[PDB]
């Protein structure tokens, strides 16, 4: 860990040992990163396979992926039926359970039925589309469940129907189970002691549903790289590790209950009884975590929020160094999307500018599916101090979300990390978003970290749902640009980037449009797509192919080769540096791993033996050693 290149040499490693991979039965394997939906932000998806689920389901819907503070996900879809009925979908074990939304909303807090009506219909009281869809929702509940007159009596009801499925205990009352359903499922990025904020978000998510079915909100594309983030390696590794030490607590219960299926000897205050129980449970969890890394098979009876069960870990290859340093810079959309033959997910988009490399993707079957990150694209690792941001929005023009009672696209819902904190206008919203960017890159205000992304979305005729979204959490995608006031550095994510104006060179900065400029136009490329010499002169399928040819060269795997035991190593003997090279060749230290040699090359058709991609090597060059390798 805290170790010098001199000490890595003495302890039988390379002097620039990179790490980041597990050694499992000798084979070096690593956890592949993924692309999943951005956390804590209600997307506005339309999807044709919701009417394939049941009768009168529309294709409309609101989908939120809520993460807990231990990085465990929970996805809640909010459907729209053609009745006017609105439901609430979740998945608890591997099953899939639906509930009416006013059964949640009247269980989250004590609600007058107009505070449901006012929370959705904030103003725009006289909108005929909207005040009619909602009196099929309050009326349709009071009709169907007429014996629910307050908050506890629906928690009595909901904990009764959901008692067996949560494997709840016979001492728990129904409002202890029914409270646990609302603490384990709905909008869990707010947690316990956050019932009012889980109630403000669902009323936001209902107007976003109703403003989607009215065609006032463009549907959010879940491939558009502003609505998706990175599931990191070790974060997955501690999501599966929680579920294995949850099965360990269940096998203790399953072992004690198989002692009261018999009648042997049970006193739960006996120390020697406990050791008899715990010597029988298979407690070798580190073999269940090795088996994940050994195979890739995510096996969990609990069921994680990810929709495949394979390919989570891959073999870190060492056929050269360019192959190896590109595994750690590789991201993937998921194994579920290669099954399709609709090629929308494979298409390169403008919102991947500086986050995903346009060049460095594999030719062939994972073309578009297996893109790599760009050069200066840093992924967030921990979250930031956001407990001081609400006090700074209140110093600005924000009226709080506890007093205002006003919703819909006519205003600018200020949210940080998926918690609605207040409401402003749209003209005030752009001033708040811009002063926060000036207070961020000017590092004077204590509560603004530089990694906070300020996602202002201005209003527009039938565009994206306007608001002001601020994110600071884990696993985001960040890259630096130069803010044009102060000539500082600004950390910009992909949700921000759609509505900003980032000039490429300084010479192209036009007046009164650009607030940001790139540091270098080479920051949008990969590592390996950036080492192609003069790569703006080739045709684009030829830059993408060097990114596949260069991984498969035989070069230098490393210099500590007398202390390893690998299935295959290819090693080029006589490497040379390039005379023609990029300056990022030196910054990554690719001289330690010479991949290739210089050759006096004559472009000539002389022999007749070279057509159709054939080449002629010199014989005496070969005899004197020329690309010799073992």
């Amino acid at each position: 860990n805290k170790m010098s290149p001199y000490e890595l040499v003495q302890h039988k490693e390379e002097s620039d040992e990179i790490g980041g991979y597990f050694i499992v039965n000798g084979i070096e394997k690593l956890i592949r990163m993924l692309i999943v939906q951005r956390r804590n932000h209600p997307m506005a998806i339309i999807r044709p396979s919701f009417a394939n689920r049941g009768a009168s389901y529309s294709h409309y819907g609101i989908q939120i992926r809520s993460v807990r503070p231990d990085q465990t996900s929970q996805t809640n879809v909010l459907h729209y039926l053609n009745d006017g009925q609105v439901t609430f979908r979740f998945s608890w074990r591997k099953n899939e359970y639906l509930v009416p939304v006013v059964m949640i909303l009247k269980a989250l807090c004590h609600t007058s039925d107009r505070e449901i009506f006012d929370g959705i219909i904030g103003n725009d009281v006289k909108d005929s589309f909207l005040t009619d869809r909602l009196e099929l929702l309050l009326r349709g509940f009071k009709k169907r469940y007429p014996h629910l007159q307050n908050r506890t009596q629906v928690l009595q009801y909901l904990g009764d129907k959901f008692r067996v499925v949560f494997q709840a205990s016979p001492d728990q009352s129904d409002l202890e189970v029914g409270q646990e359903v609302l603490d384990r499922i709905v909008l869990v990025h707010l947690g316990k002691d956050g019932s009012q904020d889980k109630f403000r978000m669902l009323l936001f998510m209902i107007r976003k549903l109703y403003s989607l079915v009215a065609g006032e909100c463009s549907p959010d594309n879940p491939d558009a790289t502003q609505h998706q983030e990175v599931l990191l390696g070790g974060f997955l590794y501690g999501m599966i590790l929680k579920e294995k030490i949850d099965e360990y607590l269940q096998n203790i219960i399953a072992q004690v209950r198989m002692d009261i299926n018999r009648g042997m000897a049970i006193n739960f205050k006996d120390k020697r009884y406990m050791s008899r129980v715990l010597m029988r449970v298979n407690e070798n969890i580190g073999s269940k975590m090795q088996y994940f890394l050994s195979t890739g098979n995510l096996v969990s009876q609990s069921g994680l929020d990810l929709q495949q069960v394979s390919g989570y870990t891959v073999v870190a290859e060492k056929i050269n160094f360019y192959r190896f340093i590109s595994h750690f810079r590789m991201v993937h959309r998921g194994s579920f999307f290669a099954q399709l033959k609709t090629t929308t997910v494979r298409k390169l988009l403008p919102e991947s500018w500086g986050f995903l490399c346009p060049v460095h993707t594999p030719d062939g079957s994972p073309c578009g599916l297996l893109n790599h990150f760009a050069h200066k694209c840093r992924i967030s690792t921990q979250q930031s101090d956001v407990s001081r941001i609400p006090s700074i929005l209140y110093s600005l023009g924000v009226a709080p979300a506890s007093h205002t009672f006003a919703a819909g696209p006519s205003l600018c819902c200020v949210q940080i990390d998926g918690k609605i904190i207040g409401w402003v206008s749209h003209e005030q919203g752009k001033i708040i978003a811009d002063t926060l960017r000036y207070w961020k890159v000017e590092g004077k205000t204590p509560g603004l970290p530089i990694d906070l992304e300020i996602g202002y979305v201005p209003p527009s005729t039938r565009g994206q749902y306007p608001g002001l979204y601020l994110f600071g959490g884990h696993s985001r995608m960040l890259r630096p640009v130069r803010y044009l006031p102060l000539d500082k550095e600004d950390i910009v994510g992909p949700f921000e980037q759609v509505y900003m104006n980032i000039a490429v060179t300084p010479q192209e900065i036009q007046n009164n449009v650009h607030t940001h400029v790139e540091f270098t136009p080479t920051n949008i490329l990969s590592i390996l797509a950036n080492l192609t010499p003069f790569s703006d002169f080739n045709q684009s399928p030829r830059n993408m192919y060097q990114c596949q040819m260069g991984k498969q060269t035989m070069g230098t795997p490393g210099v500590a080769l007398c202390h390893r035991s690998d299935n295959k190593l290819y090693r080029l003997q006589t490497g040379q540096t390039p005379i023609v090279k990029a300056n990022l060749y030196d910054d990554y230290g690719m001289d330690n791993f010479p991949n290739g040699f210089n050759a006096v090359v004559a472009v000539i058709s002389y022999t007749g033996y070279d057509m159709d991609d054939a080449m002629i090597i010199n014989k005496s060059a070969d005899e004197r050693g020329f690309g010799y390798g073992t």
Partner: protein, 57 residues
Amino acid sequence: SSRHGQKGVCSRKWPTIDMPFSETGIQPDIIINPHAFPSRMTIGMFVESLAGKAGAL
């Protein structure tokens, strides 16, 4: 392969003497066919060829 996606197999280890020598006396190590260039448009290789010769001199 060069660094521009111009891969090709070795067709023949061609002997030294019957291979075009230069005014300088240099004989090339690799002969590449000029017909591989129009269909591929790798002009990053035509500029690498005279940037690596200026840099060697």
